[PDB]
Design an enzyme around this catalytic site. Structure first.
Site: not given
Ligand SMILES: CC(C)=CCC/C(C)=C/CC/C(C)=C/CONC(=O)CP(=O)(O)O
Ligand SMILES: [Zn+2]
Lengths: 323, 6, 407
Positions: C281, C346, C343, C278, C283-284, C336, C232, C275
């Site tokens: 978004d 983002h 928010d 999926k 933020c990526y 997103d 991820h 990932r």
């Molecule tokens: C320093 C920090 C706190 C960095 C955080 C980095 C991130 C954003 C990690 C993701 C954690 C996570 C909960 C991943 C899986 O859950 N997220 C989703 O389901 C969103 P997507 O569908 O895009 O994977």
């Molecule tokens: Zn996001």
């Protein structure tokens, strides 16, 4: 007792059994920044939570209060910590607590604290009997819930519950063959059980993956899995692979197949294959088709690969500047 | 919806 | 030429990038298709409206949203009551990116607020009175460094901070996120970030950490939260950035990592997914695309000769197009994807990503790509800490004057 959402819910400051405690307002300072204008309910619960936390009151009423604090903001890790302190001090029935965490996770499954709490409960009880089925239910609502899959791997690994997982993986891959979380789980199960060195297993896996690639040639997960399980030993180590992929070029082409061919060439070139040059050119030809036509979004990567192969595999690459 | 990071 | 469309997402050939479901429909394809249709509408909007496309970063709008949010937030933010230092960080960084000055009244008030979040035993909590946690600690430190005044720096209790990190350190090299909390790659990054910036890294603090992080890299090439988990972007950024701080990037298979991240950029949308299989978004734009500057630096440190001298290994133009056309809220703030509400998280990350996509810098070589109006150019961001490169240099330099706690 009194649900945070019941029509008859009453603020804590209006509860008789809480008359002895003075709520503790939040200390934001003289001139606050990022100040949240909380609702009445929220601020009221948290003012009382602050009060019990500060007094370290380990009581039943404090315990019930954390449930409300959690429903208001399940991400409040400080509240979860205090709740675990209360679960131990008050000698609360942990199965009743398991019932509670399963309900909470059902409603807020994408939260870190809820899954960590469930894990601690399982560790405390040393009982994984409800896990795989619970997780399966969450995964039935969101087959890609990351925390759910992570908890599932922990349970399976810590309690050696490998027996039925490949069957579970097969079932989910049937539902959505594009579920990358399932392909990752498939790899997790296999590498921790039989491993991929066992030629019969590896063979089986590749047959399966190629078969899935044929049914859905554009599903990137199957492609990444195939490369994933073969790349460590070396793609060139499997001579029939190339020939067989080429056979899919007609009615099963994709920028994924083209990319794989380049990876096979790259490794062949890395392990001094025959016709060094013929191979290099085939590769650069594909890198260009990708960068300019079939996979332009990745033009910078493909140009770089083409340049790397050129840099170390051209007939001129080992020739001194003087020649 | 929100993205969780902690 | 006159028939030539300067915007990559609007060219006729671009339509060939739409999803091919092979007539086999699954939840994944259906979801991907929905997003692509919504994004296609955004792209085609200028055409169906008979207007010349103009990509403008709504600065005035974003500034208003940020300026106010830095002071007061609606109850919509109750779910972030345990992440206030993050709110400080996301907002201050977005303002820094937009090149908006931080009034000293604001700076001092943020400092005092963060002091209140700081635990007596080290680290910062999500708000006053909350137990310390590595995520809010990372955010607090970054926010104080963005301010970068003697006051800001002095808020950090370094001896306690170091004690805090040690209390979380595990025998296998990993760190807990907080006492009695979970373990995943985010903690390694949070710890490495704050410890490097404040100069508190002792000889053994990160023993085994690099190895632990390397075990998180999986068959996909990317990095998962813990060993065995799906790769991820959020965790991959944390893993690589932490290794970069520890000067141990080499522990990873950088080739498979680079191949995985570059594949995360969506061919149609132009933005990144978190990932494989999926959705895209905004933020990526940072978590994923931010890996390229890191990979470039790592590969270049190994003397890789094939490395471009003007671009990152991703479609910078397409990412900027995605962000500018699909991730801006008319009222201010970023998001997103179309349909999602804005928010601060983002807003911070879409902008950080935009900056990365606009600025390429490999030592002496420097090359920018600013899509749309030239006023769209943001201030650069450090790919490891996600704060201004100048703030990073300033902070490290100041903290290097102090001795590593203990000595
Ligand atoms: C320093 C920090 C706190 C960095 C955080 C980095 C991130 C954003 C990690 C993701 C954690 C996570 C909960 C991943 C899986 O859950 N997220 C989703 O389901 C969103 P997507 O569908 O895009 O994977
Ligand atoms: Zn996001």
């Amino acid at each position: 007792f009194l649900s945070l959402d019941s029509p008859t819910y009453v603020l804590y400051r209006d509860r008789a059994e809480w008359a002895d405690i003075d709520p503790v307002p939040q200390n934001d300072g003289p001139s606050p920044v990022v100040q949240i204008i909380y609702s009445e309910k929220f601020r009221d619960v948290y003012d009382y939570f602050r009060a019990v936390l500060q007094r370290d009151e380990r009581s039943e009423r404090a315990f019930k209060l954390t449930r409300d604090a959690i429903e208001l903001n399940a991400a409040n890790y400080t509240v979860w910590h205090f709740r675990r302190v209360l679960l131990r001090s008050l000698q609360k029935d942990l199965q009743e607590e398991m019932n509670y965490i399963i309900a909470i996770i059902e409603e807020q499954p994408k939260n870190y604290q809820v899954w960590h709490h469930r894990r601690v409960l399982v560790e405390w009880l040393k009982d994984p009997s409800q896990e795989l089925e619970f997780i399966a239910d969450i995964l039935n609502q969101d087959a890609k819930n990351y925390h759910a899959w992570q908890h599932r791997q922990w349970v399976i690994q810590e309690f050696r519950l490998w027996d039925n997982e490949l069957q579970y993986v097969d079932q989910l891959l049937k539902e959505d063959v594009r579920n990358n979380s399932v392909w990752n789980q498939r790899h997790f199960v296999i590498s921790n059980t039989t491993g991929y060195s066992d030629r019969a297993v590896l063979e089986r896996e590749v047959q399966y993956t190629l078969e899935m690639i044929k049914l859905v040639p554009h599903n990137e997960s199957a492609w990444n899995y195939l490369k994933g399980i073969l790349q460590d030993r070396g793609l060139s180590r499997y001579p029939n692979l190339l020939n067989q992929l080429l056979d899919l070029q007609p009615s099963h082409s994709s920028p994924y197949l083209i990319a794989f061919l380049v990876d096979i060439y790259e490794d062949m070139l890395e392990n001094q294959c025959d016709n060094k040059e013929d191979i290099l050119n085939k590769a650069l030809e594909l890198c260009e088709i990708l960068a300019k036509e079939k996979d332009t979004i990745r033009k910078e990567y493909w140009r770089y690969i083409g340049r790397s192969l050129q840099s170390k595999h051209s007939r001129e690459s080992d020739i001194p500047a003087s020649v | 919806t929100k993205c969780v990071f902690m | 030429p006159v028939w030539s469309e300067p915007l990559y997402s609007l060219r006729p050939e671009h339509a060939r990038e739409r999803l091919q479901d092979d007539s086999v429909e699954t939840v994944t394809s259906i979801e991907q298709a929905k997003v692509e249709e919504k994004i296609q509408e955004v792209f085609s909007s200028y055409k169906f409206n008979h207007l010349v496309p103009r990509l403008v970063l709504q600065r005035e709008k974003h500034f208003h949203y940020l300026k106010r949010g830095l002071r007061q937030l609606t109850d919509a933010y109750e779910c972030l009551d345990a992440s206030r230092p993050w709110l400080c960080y996301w907002i201050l960084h977005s303002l820094e990116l937009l090149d908006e000055p931080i009034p000293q009244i604001v700076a001092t008030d943020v400092c005092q607020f963060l002091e209140l979040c700081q635990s007596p035993d080290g680290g910062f909590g999500g708000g006053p009175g909350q137990y310390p946690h590595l995520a809010p600690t990372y955010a607090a430190v970054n926010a104080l460094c963005i301010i970068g005044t003697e006051e800001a720096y002095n808020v950090i209790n370094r001896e306690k901070l170091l004690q805090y990190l040690y209390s979380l350190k595990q025998p296998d090299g990993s760190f807990l996120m907080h006492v009695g909390g979970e373990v995943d790659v985010r903690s390694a990054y949070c710890a490495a970030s704050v410890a490097s910036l404040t100069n508190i890294i002792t000889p053994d603090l990160f023993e085994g950490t690099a190895e632990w992080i390397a075990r998180c890299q999986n068959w996909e090439g990317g990095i998962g939260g813990v060993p065995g988990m799906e790769a991820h972007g959020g965790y991959t950024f944390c893993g690589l950035a932490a290794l970069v701080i520890l000067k141990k990037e080499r522990s990873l298979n950088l080739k498979s990592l680079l191949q995985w991240v570059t594949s995360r950029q969506m061919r149609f949308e132009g933005g990144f997914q978190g990932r494989c299989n999926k959705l895209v978004d905004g933020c990526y734009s940072f978590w994923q695309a931010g890996l390229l500057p890191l990979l470039h630096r790592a590969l270049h440190a190994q003397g890789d000769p094939a490395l471009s001298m003007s671009h990152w290994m991703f479609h910078q133009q397409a990412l900027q197009e995605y962000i500018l056309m699909c991730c801006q809220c008319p009222a201010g703030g970023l998001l997103d994807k179309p349909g999602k509400s804005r928010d601060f998280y983002h807003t911070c990350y879409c902008l950080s990503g935009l900056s990365i996509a606009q600025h390429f810098g490999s030592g002496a070589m420097l090359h920018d790509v600013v899509m749309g109006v030239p006023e769209n150019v943001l201030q650069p961001t450090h790919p490891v800490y996600n704060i201004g490169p100048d703030k990073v240099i300033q902070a490290t330099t100041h903290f290097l004057q102090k001795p590593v706690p203990g000595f």
